[PDB]
Every structure is written in structure tokens, then in C-alpha cells.
């Protein structure tokens, strides 16, 4: 039925809009999580 009729001539499960959203800054925020309450 009805040819749509015409004249002219990895594994990132929305973890990709997580992972291609994710590539250049945070790897020293992976156990850089705890040093901040004597100065700051």
C-alpha cells in the first residue's frame, strides 16, 4: 500500500545525551569529592 509517493529524482541509553554531553572536565572530581572545610 501507498509507496509514500514521490516526484523528484557506545551503548549510552540516554546515557549518550549524558555521555556525548560528557568529555573534557571532571576526572579529578571522581575522588575529588572531600578536601574543602579548613580554607574554604
Amino acid at each position: 500500500m501507498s509507496e509514500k509517493k514521490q516526484p523528484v529524482d557506545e551503548d549510552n541509553w540516554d546515557d549518550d545525551n549524558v555521555e556525548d554531553d560528557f568529555s573534557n572536565q571532571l576526572r579529578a572530581e571522581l575522588e575529588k569529592h572531600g578536601y574543602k572545610m579548613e580554607t574554604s
Binding site: M1, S2, E3, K4, K5, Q6, P7
Partner: protein, 257 residues
Amino acid sequence: MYEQLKGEWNRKSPNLSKCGEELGRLKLVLLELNFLPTTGTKLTKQQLILARDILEIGAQWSILRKDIPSFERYMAQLKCYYFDYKEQLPESAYMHQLLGLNLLFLLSQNRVAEFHTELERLPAKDIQTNVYIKHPVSLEQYLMEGSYNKVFLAKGNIPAESYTFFIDILLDTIRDEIAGCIEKAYEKILFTEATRILFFNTPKKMTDYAKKRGWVLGPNNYYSFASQQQKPEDTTIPSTELAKQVIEYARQLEMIV
């Protein structure tokens, strides 16, 4: 016992009292032993091997005379004898295109639900071999994306005899929803878009669209008509029955349950 087995077998079959004699043969088939379990005496399936074949040509007689309600009556009784409850079934060669005749009978009548429940029973039969089923499923793999009149560009590949009676229904069941879709939001087109792209530069295909449908080619256009509505609303027609829900809400909430 084998009443007129191959009399008018190959050349023609113009006889009309042959069929009642063929039914008279079929009086004997269901009355020798049984049909429903067909449990014992495997030799009583041997005339049922030929009772398959005489209904095959009976379906060939129905496709000769264009009998749609018989062609499903033959095929269902055949398939339920291909589903004999003692399914031992020595292989006949005429089964694989008879199902192809069934698979093209059924595809051309918008039985796509009946299609994809048919393929469950023959996993490697339908794919790895059997071009009489491989072609209607490569038809259906064409019939997924955009290849429905590319189908007509692959018309000239029939492995069997002509198959004309069900590509004509496939001619019918495409060109009418073609006419249904141009009644829709595909608003209007000139004559030459109906020429190159529908198919077939001008035969009485222009008589097909002007008479089955409207779309009279006046001054250089096919003309659409009014296909809209008014959309009225009251929204206080529910004000009788939305009050019925609210009375029911305080009904059960007040009753000692």
C-alpha cells in the same frame, strides 16, 4: 476409488458436473475412516496425500474461475490437513507455492495481522529456502519502509505461473488508498503528477480516477473540495453528568462502610 483422477488435469477444466463428481469423490474421502484425528493406519493418509492434491487443483480451479470464498475454503481445509493431528506429513512439492498463493491472497487484503502470525510456524522454511515464500516476505520487507510501488518495479519477477489475480488485487489495494490519501491533506496536484508517479502514462487510468473517484481534470488541475468541519462545543452537556460524579463522591464517603 480414484474417481476421474487426472482426466481434465492439465489442459482445461470446463466441466461443471465434474465438481459434484469431485465432491462425490470428496464424499468418499471423509467417509473411508475419519478426518479429525486420523490416528491409525498411516495408509489412510495416503489418499489424504492425494486429497491434498485434488484440493490444490480445486484451488487452481477456483483461481481459474475467480472464486474468493472457495479459495479460502480450500486453503483452510488444506492447512488443517497440513495440521493433521498426526503430523507426520511426507513432503509434497506443491505445498510451498500453495502457501505462497495463500501468502499473496492474504497480503493483498490488508491482513498484515494475519501475515505476521502466519510466519511463526515456519522459522527456516520461510527464509533460508522456498522462493515462493521468500518472494512474498521480500515483498513484505519491501512493504515496510518505502517500497510499495518499487514493488511494481519488481513486478516482473514471478517464480510460478502468472500470479496476476493477486497482483491485480495488489493493484487494487494500493491505487485506492492512493486515492484516499489524495482526498486527505495532500491537497491538489496537476495531471502530470498523476501520470509519471502513480504509474502508466495515459491509458484509461484517467478513466479509473475520474469515475471511481471524482478529481475531474478541468483547466489543468485535479481539484479538491471541502474536507473540513465546524468543531462545535457545549461543555455543559457534561454539567448534568459531572454533577452525577460529585453526588456519587459524597455518597460513598458519607455511607457507613
